[PDB]
Amino acid sequence: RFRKVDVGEYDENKFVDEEAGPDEGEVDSCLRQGNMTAALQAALKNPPINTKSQAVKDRAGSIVLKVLISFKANDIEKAVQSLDKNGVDLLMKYIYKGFESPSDNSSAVLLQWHEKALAAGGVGSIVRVLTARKTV
Amino acid sequence: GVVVDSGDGVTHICPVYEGFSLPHLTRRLDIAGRDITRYLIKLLLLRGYAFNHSADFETVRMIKEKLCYVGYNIEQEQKLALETTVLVESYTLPDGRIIKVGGERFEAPEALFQPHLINVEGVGVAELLFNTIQAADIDTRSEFYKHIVLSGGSTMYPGLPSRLERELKQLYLERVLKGDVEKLSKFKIRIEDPPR
Amino acid sequence: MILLEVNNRIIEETLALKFENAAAGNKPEAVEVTFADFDGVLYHISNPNGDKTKVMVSISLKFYKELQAHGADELLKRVYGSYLVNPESGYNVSLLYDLENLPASKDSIVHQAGMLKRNCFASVFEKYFQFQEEGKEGENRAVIHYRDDETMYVESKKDRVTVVFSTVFKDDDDVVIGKVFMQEFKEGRRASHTAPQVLFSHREPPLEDTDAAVGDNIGYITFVLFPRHTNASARDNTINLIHTFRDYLHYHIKCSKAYIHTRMRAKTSDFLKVLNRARP
Amino acid sequence: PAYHSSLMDPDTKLIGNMALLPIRSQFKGPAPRETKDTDIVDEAIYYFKANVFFKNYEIKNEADRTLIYITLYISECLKKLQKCNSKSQGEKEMYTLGITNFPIPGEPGFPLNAIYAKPANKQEDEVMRAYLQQLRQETGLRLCEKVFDPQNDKPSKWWTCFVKRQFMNKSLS
Amino acid sequence: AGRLPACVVDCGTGYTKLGYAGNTEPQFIIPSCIAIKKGVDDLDFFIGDEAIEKPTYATKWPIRHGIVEDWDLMERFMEQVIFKYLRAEPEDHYFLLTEPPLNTPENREYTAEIMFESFNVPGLYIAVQAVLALAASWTSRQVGERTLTGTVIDSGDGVTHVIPVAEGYVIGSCIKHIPIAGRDITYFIQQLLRDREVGIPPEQSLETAKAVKERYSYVCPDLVKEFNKYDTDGSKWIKQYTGINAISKKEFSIDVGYERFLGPEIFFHPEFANPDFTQPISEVVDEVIQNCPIDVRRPLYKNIVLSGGSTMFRDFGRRLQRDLKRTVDARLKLSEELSKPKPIDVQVITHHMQRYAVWFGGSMLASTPEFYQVCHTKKDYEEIGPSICRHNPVFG
Amino acid sequence: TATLRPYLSAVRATLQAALCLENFSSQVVERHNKPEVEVRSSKELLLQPVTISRNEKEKVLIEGSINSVRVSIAVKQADEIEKILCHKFMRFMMMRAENFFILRRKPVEGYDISFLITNFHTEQMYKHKLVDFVIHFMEEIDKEISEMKLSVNARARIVAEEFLKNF
Amino acid sequence: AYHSFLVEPISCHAWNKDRTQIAICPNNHEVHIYEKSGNKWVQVHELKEHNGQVTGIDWAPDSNRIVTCGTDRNAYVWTLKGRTWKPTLVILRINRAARCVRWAPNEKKFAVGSGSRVISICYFEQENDWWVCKHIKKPIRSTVLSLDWHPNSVLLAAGSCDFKCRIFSAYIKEVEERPAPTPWGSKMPFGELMFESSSSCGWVHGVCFSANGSRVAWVSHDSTVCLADADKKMAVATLASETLPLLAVTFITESSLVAAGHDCFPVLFTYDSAAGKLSFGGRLDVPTARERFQNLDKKAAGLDSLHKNSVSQISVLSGGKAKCSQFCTTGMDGGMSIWDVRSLESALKDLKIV
Structure with a gap:
């Protein structure tokens, strides 16, 4: 009956991980004006890398999600091509957040983002999604 | 410290006090090599391989030596056996027929820790070892707990020392520190398993 | 095989073999057979009182009383006539073939014996077809x-x-x-x-x-x-x-x-x- | 197991490592004389139909070698004896096929050279050669009555059918 | 045990025996074969005798060396077994099927998947053939002790197996085979006949041997004695077969001779017919017992059991017992006289239910209330998985 | 159609990332070697789980570790007949997991079928070919379900006619 | 140039001083030494002592000694006695798998990284007649995957699964003299943590000191290569790759790296010291009279690289880390490749070392 407590839980070792938001006004602002590329760049500003608030993380993802949903397919390429490598890395992370809430065909255009982001960033950009300790 | 010896015939816990072996407090385990082998014969039966208890004993011993190991967290091991096929190994019999062996690998040696499984009265190698230490002079206690050394053919199962350590820590926590998780950190055991 | 066959093979083949041996003039072997059909039916083939010259085929249906309210007894009488006898204990209908007293042509009777079950069921259909x-x-x-x-x-x-x-x-x-x-x-x-x-x-x-x-x-x-x-x-x-x-x-x-x-x-x-x- | 010979005395005589065994016959050769009324030729002919099917055979003693030999010859006879009508033509072709110089131990053509000793000298050669001939004739003889159906012109199929079977898968010819 | 008896189906390489538990003989013995040619094309097939020529269908044999080799075809063959011949509504009957010793656990799962996922049986038991043959011998007069230790001589389709059994469980590592079975006796009888009797339609050569084997054969005590009996009293021993030229409808008339007793002899003298294998059935049994655990050898020799058509030749048992006894004391002579242990009791058990020993065994067991306790149920199969069918506890 | 190839392309690219494994001896138990994505007792060895969704129903979940990848698929199931043919086909394949090597005996909860690929598999088969396989599987399972379904209809029609034409 | 030793992994390899022999672990408990005979490879020895899988091999050049370590928690030191190699047990007192082993440049000690979350530095006693060790513990929190010694035989770079590249002092006083200052710092008591990478990105599969030891490079699971120079306040340059993670890395000059991994081919990176940045200049695996002939296409593992599975080890074969001319790669495919830096320079005109 003693074998019921996981002593592992309280182990001298037991790896411990070492221990913001984009501005929604700015995003809406570019959105409402038809300035999609600019809305993208704004939405990928200041991700909440370090906060143990899921709320704040979902805030961020959703703001980004909204920018991506709003694009016309034939306009993704240039937008993605306007980013730098830290940009595409960050983007790919948000595309993978997108995939967790399909909602309308959103699923369908996220898949387009995925493809353009992959052409820019390579599979290495996905690798940094999986290896990220601190995520969106 | 304490020598846990276990061969095909039998299993003794011998605590040794600086130079000389104290018969008082020495204990036997009524479970050993030949018993694990026979249990492995019962488990392989339920898996649809019927070895005769005499004609085939040598063959099942070789399966045991080759493939059995001690599970560290039994419920976690059962999940692995039940959800995946990673534990499943192929073994070639004397006549060339291939059998496949999975969960029985860790289940047979578990008799060592849960002797009720093979119909034996008692408490099993870790509970017995703890008892043996917690009956000795409250001050020799610690030097024993840091010199447990394994002996014999039936102590080489991969994972065995880790399972003991986990189990003592489980006992010590409840039966010495009645649930006190914070003062547990300072309990120090480290069975070694010599490569000889 | 798309349509299920109606007649019962065990019945037809068991009788065929009894009738063939009786024709050849062989000494009759004992027969004792228990077998089923679809939907709860149980059949028995046996020698009454151990008399190997007599072969009985009996059928058992949990719902027989129900068919019996709808013409079954009268229907079986029309088909089986003096082959129908008092039903064996455990069974609802029993047919009795005397190996020392068969028609010259065994076919029709072997055939009807194979449709015992189907014959038990026909009366309820024949009644309501009449009403129509x-x-x-x-x-x-x-x-x-x-x-x-x-x-x-x-x-x-x-x-x-x-x-x-x-x-x-x-x-x-x-x-x-x-x-x-x-x-x-x-x-x-x-x-x-x-x-x-x-x-x-x-x-x-x-x-x-x-x-x-x-x-x-x-x-x-x-x-x-x-x-x-x-x-x-x-x-x-x-x-x-x-x-x-x-x-x-x-x-x-x-x-x-x-x-x-x-x-x-x-x-x-x-x-x-x-x-x-x-x-x- | 197969049928072996009982006639071997701890003191019967040995040409090569065969047994020089008494046979009672109207033929010439160094075969001893016998009191009793069964000889190795009767054993072979009696045992033949059983034994011809065997493919393996333990030489327990030297009498067995003689038996083997007669067993193989028996099949030589029926080889000829099959294709020829009336007893007469039969015992006729049996004189011929008896005299023929059949291979003997030590010669290319005698099967079982690994089992049978070869004659140490010309004496033994001429003896053995003769003994073998005695048997081919006494054998070829007795067998002739048996093969023919007392209502004559008739090679009994109950013998002619063994024609193809080969004892120990070996042939004198 | 409810109102309805269980279905008992024993699938061998050559024949499948089927009917209901309780009965003494199968209700059908049908060759284990299925002839075949979108839609319901899959339902266009026949099995057993109807399947053998069939001008426009190919005959297949799903079972080889006792093991299902074509699962699609064994499945289909089941469909007719259940719905055409047994006429069992498979959802209302427990089933007992059989398996050769050494069939794998995986195969038992495959069988269960068929019985529970396609046919929805309520219960299934897979028995080992060897074990049912022992159970069959409890019918014998010479048997007062009901036991499932014994040695089983199974002369099936293509070879004969000597299967040692202890306490319900075949000793797998001790099984031996003999490349002698009924087909060979037929082939050898065909041989012997071919070069004696004139006018066997070269085309009906085989069917003629089979007929002679099945009607006129037997095992003798001694070939030479037997040969001279035949040689003497021809009118007692030679027999007549008359057949029927298939093509040219003209009858032929032959004699049946030596092959009467030489046929079955090849069990005892495999060198007569097999040029590669010479060990007599008797020696093979001996070897098998001597390989088994010492403490079980006496029980084995005491309870040697027959199963299959080829074991039915009059006197097969007597001759087996006799020859094995001669071997066993030959050994125990060359032991006392080499410097004195108890003599070995050797018993070869015969009985009436031999030809389908296996099927009879199962029929009897699946009649008992305990059969219902040891079967796996459909509820078990669903909640725990097909692995439950890997083990079938012995009972009786 | 329309959205298939884009889905597969995203899945494939994620598998390519996840199947980069090596042999890892257990840090938790002496002389054990265990798939870390299953046993989970060293958080540092686990990658971030991710998901690629075609739509609200069809998705693939990918869970990497140093050692091993778990891949869970939610297969397209349009009506009640495809749902039961699907469930029956996955079950049929799971029973046979000892022959697939790469299949879990049970799906991760919420999915129809799950693979567990380990460094042992990637040492013994080409990694790029496994990726190929997982994609071929997803395409192939839809086609088979979809053929199974046509067959049931085809035989249902002949079976009704044969019975009805006989009256 | 590719040779196939087997089809299962080469887990690890080591070459002798002369590069005429190569020791490989063919995915099992043994180590197999091969020698070249004309143009063929020939197995010459088979080292059977390990009781589990071999994971590290190092070959000390001047002493001709081979050290191995194994998932069985052992290390052995192998001595050549006549014509057979003889193992000596080193008691590591670890309770989990050894993962890597490297002889220090002075050959007076060697380092084992293990699953015990420690690095054991071992040395021999001309006193008691055997090998002893001291453990570097803090602040390692996970398995040590990768080791490389600084040319002073004192500093020691280590990569691990807690996501970090570190530099340590492994100074053992009873075998060597006090070390000289270095830009990694001037105080090196045993176990001293000299340097620790900060952002915690990726399991660190490989580490390399530059030939003069002032730069340390490593490759990680997040598909970055990184480099720190002590001559610039241990500032760290970073390059994030577009492809799969590297598992092995080495300096081929002071400003040039070669690495390879799950992509299955070697690539080149250069550091510009002035700007403090890493660049990808690479992909070195691309598909005289004899040469013109054989390359000609005919008339008639679907992968355009020499290796057919992941590259996990890279070693400099000649010219050392300052001016490398030949290097070797072994892989999960069981293949070994020898790369000629100057043939690469020739056959690739776009290519710029340093």
């Missing part, structure tokens, strides 16, 4: 509990006769496959304009209410039969088909699963070739 031919309307329906949890309902109407089967799909896989079969029965008029029309109702009885069964696993199949089907020239064949329906449907559900398996075997095994071609 005679314009007798408003007669109470036949209710026949042909299995512990399935029931057949027989009713005559001005212009048509209806047979309803309340059936159970034990498996939740079988309901769905069953439904596909039923949908195609409901549409079988589009390939035989004369055929009986078939209705189907999942879970719910037809409104036409009482003590009938309801459940996720129940289906109701209705056969609308017309005079071309119930008349004097068609009724025998019509009876051979209808009383085999429930079993036909269930057998086709099971053969489909066997067929699906052969597909799954082919496909899995292709997957394993591709996997193995990934080794270097």
Whole structure:
């Protein structure tokens, strides 16, 4: 009956991980004006890398999600091509957040983002999604 | 410290006090090599391989030596056996027929820790070892707990020392520190398993 | 084999062999055989009082009393005549062949003995087909509990006769496959304009209410039969088909699963070739 | 197991490592004389139909070698004896096929050279050669009555059918 | 045990025996074969005798060396077994099927998948053939002790197996085979006949041997004695077969001789017919017992059991017992006289239910209330998985 | 159609990332070697789980570790007949997991079928070919379900006709 | 130039001083030494002592000694006595798998990284006649995957699964003299943590000191290569790759790296010291009279690289880390490749070392 407590839980070792938001006004602002590329760049500003608030993380993802949903397919390429490598890395992370809430065909255009982001960033950009300790 | 010896015939816990072996407090385990082998014969039966208890004993011993190991967290091991096929190994019999062996690998040696499984009265190698230490002079206690050394053919199962350590820590926590998780950190055991 | 056979092989072959040995003038061997048929039927072949020159075939049906309220005893008498005897304890009908007193041509009797079960069932159909031919309307329906949890309902109407089967799909896989079969029965008029029309109702009885069964696993199949089907020239064949329906449907559900398996075997095994071609 | 010979005395005589065994016959050769009324030729002919099917045979003693030899010859006879009508033509072709210089131990053509000793000298050669001939004739003789159906012109199929079977898968010819 | 008896189906390489538990003989013995040619194309097939010529269908043999080799075809063959011949509504009967010793656990799962996923049986038990043959011998007069230790001589389709059994469980590592079975006796009888009797339609050569084997054969005590009996009293021993030229409808008339007793002899003298294998059945049995655990050898020799058609030749048992006894004391002579242990009791058990020993065994067991306790149920199969069918506890 | 190839392309690219494994001896138990994505007792060895969704129903979940990848698929199931043929086909394949090597005996909860690929598999088969396989599987399972379904309809029609034409 | 030793992994390899022998672990408990004979490879020895899988091999050049370590928790030191190699047990007192082993440049000690979350530095006693060790513990929290010694034989770079590249002092006083200052710092008591990478990105599969030891490079699971120079306040340059993670890395000059991994081919990176940045200049695996002939296409593992599975080890074969001319790669495919830096320079005109 003693074998019921996981002593592992309280182990001298037991790896411990070492221990913001984009501005929604700015995003809406570019959105409402038809300035999609600019809305993208704004939405990928200041991700909440370090906060143990899921709320704040979902805030961020959703703001980004909204920018991506709003694009016309034939306009993704240039937008993605306007980013730098830290940009595409960050983007790919948000595309993978997108995939967790399909909602309308959103699923369908996220898949387009995925493809353009992959052409820019390579599979290495996905690798940094999986290896990220601190995520969106 | 304490020598846990276990061969095909039998299993003794011998605590040794600086130079000389104290018969008082020495204990036997009524479970050993030949018993694990026979249990492995019962488990392989339920898996649809019927070895005769005499004609085939040598063959099942070789399966045991080759493939059995001690599970560290039994419920976690059962999940692995039940959800995946990673534990499943192929073994070639004397006549060339291939059998496949999975969960029985860790289940047979578990008799060592849960002797009720093979119909034996008692408490099993870790509970017995703890008892043996917690009956000795409250001050020799610690030097024993840091010199447990394994002996014999039936102590080489991969994972065995880790399972003991986990189990003592489980006992010590409840039966010495009645649930006190914070003062547990300072309990120090480290069975070694010599490569000889 | 698409249609289930009506006659029972064990009965026909056992009698054939007894009649062949009696013809050759061999000394009769003892016979003692217990066997079943679809839908709870149990049969016994035996020598009464140990007399090897006498062979008895008996049938047992849980629902016999029900067929017996609808003409069965009289129907069996017309077909079997002096072969029908007092029913063996445990059984509802018993036929008795004296090996020392057979017709010159054994065929007809071997054939009728194989249809014992089918003959037990025909009377309820012949009664309600009559009611139709005679314009007798408003007669109470036949209710026949042909299995512990399935029931057949027989009713005559001005212009048509209806047979309803309340059936159970034990498996939740079988309901769905069953439904596909039923949908195609409901549409079988589009390939035989004369055929009986078939209705189907999942879970719910037809409104036409009482003590009938309801459940996720129940289906109701209705056969609308017309005079071309119930008349004097068609009724025998019509009876051979209808009383085999429930079993036909269930057998086709099971053969489909066997067929699906052969597909799954082919496909899995292709997957394993591709996997193995990934080794270097 | 197969049928072996009982006639071997701890003191019967040995040409090569065969047994020089008494046979009672109207023929010439160094075969001893016998009191009793069964000789090795009768054993072989009696045992033949059983033994011819065997493919393996333990030489327990030297009498067995003689038996083997007679067993093989028996099949030589029926080889000829089959294709020829009336007893007469038969015992006629049996004189011929008896005299023929059949291979003997030590020669290419005698099967069982690994089992049978070869003659140490010309004496033994001429003896053995003769003994063998005695048997071929006494054998070929007795067998002739047996093969023919007392209502004559008749080679009994109950013998002619063994023609193809080969004892120990070996042939004198 | 309810109102309805269980179905008992024993699938061998050459024949499948089927019917209901309780009965003494199968209700059908049918060759284990299925002739075949979108849609219901899968339902266009026949099995057993109807399957053998069939002008426009190919005959297949799903079972080889006692093991299902074509699962699609065994499945289909089941369909007719259940719905055409047995006429069992498979949802209302427990089933007992059989398996050769050494059939794998995986195969039992495959069988269960068929019985529970396609046919929805309520219960299944897979028995080992060897074990049912022992159970069959409890019918014998010479048997007062009901036991499932013994040695089983199974002369099936293509070879004969000596299967040692202890306490319900075949000792797998000790089984031996003999490349002698009924077909060979036929082939050898065909041989012997071919070069003696004139006018066997070269085309009906085989069917003629089979007929002679099945009607006129037996095992003798001693070939030479037997040969001289035949040689003397021809009118007692030679027999007549008359047949029927299939093509040219003209009858032929032959004698049946030596092959009466030489046929079955090849069990005892495999060198007569097999040029590669010479160990007599008797020696093979001996070897098998001597390989088994010492403490079980006496029980084995005490309870040697026959199963199959080829074991039915009059006197097969007597001759087996006799020869094995001669071997066993030959050993125990060359032991006392080499410096004295108890003599070995050697018993070869015969009985009436031999030809289908296996099927009879199962029929009897699946009649008992305990059979219902040890079967796996459908509820078990669903909740725990097909792995439950990997083990079938012995009972009786 | 329309959205298939884009889905597969995203899945494939994620598998390519996840199947980068090596042999890892257990840090938790002496002389054990265990798939870390299953046993989970060293958080540092686990990658971030991710998901690629085609739509609200069809998705693939990918869970990497140093050692091993778990891949869970939610297969397209349009109506009640495809749902039961699907469930039956996955079950049929799971029973046979000892022959697939790469299949879990049970799906991760919420999915129809799950693979567990380990460094042992990637040492013994070409990694790029396994990726190929997982994609071929997803395409192939839809086609088979979809053929199974046509067959049931095809035989249901012949079976009703044969019975009905006989009256 | 590719040779196939087997089809299962080469887990690890080591070459002798002369590069005429190569020791490989063919995915099992043994180590197999091969020698070249003309143009063929020939197995010459088979080292059977390990009781589990071998994971590290190092070959000390001047002493001709081979050290191995194994998932069985052992290390052995192998001595050549006549014509057979003889193992000596080193008691590591670890309770989990050894993962890597490297002889220090002075050959007076060697380092084992293990699953015990420690690095054991071992040395021999001309006193008691055997090998002893001291453990570097803090602040390692996970398995040590990768080791590389600084040319002073004192500093020691280590990569691990807690996501970090570190530099340690492994100064053992009883075998060597006090070390000289270095830009990694001037105080090196045993176990001293000299340097620790900060952002915690990826399991660190490989580490390399530059030939003069002032730069340390490593490759990680997040598909970055990184470099720190002590001559610039241990500032860290970073390059994030577009492809799969590297598992092995080495300096081929002071400003040039070669690495390889799950992509299955070697690539080149250069550091510009002035700007403090890493660049990808690479992909070195691309598909005289004899040469012109054989390359000509005919008339008639679907992968355009020499290796057919992941590259896990890279070693400099000649010219050392300052001016490398030949290097070797072994891989999960069981293949070994020898790369000629100057043939690469020739056959690739776009290519710029340093």
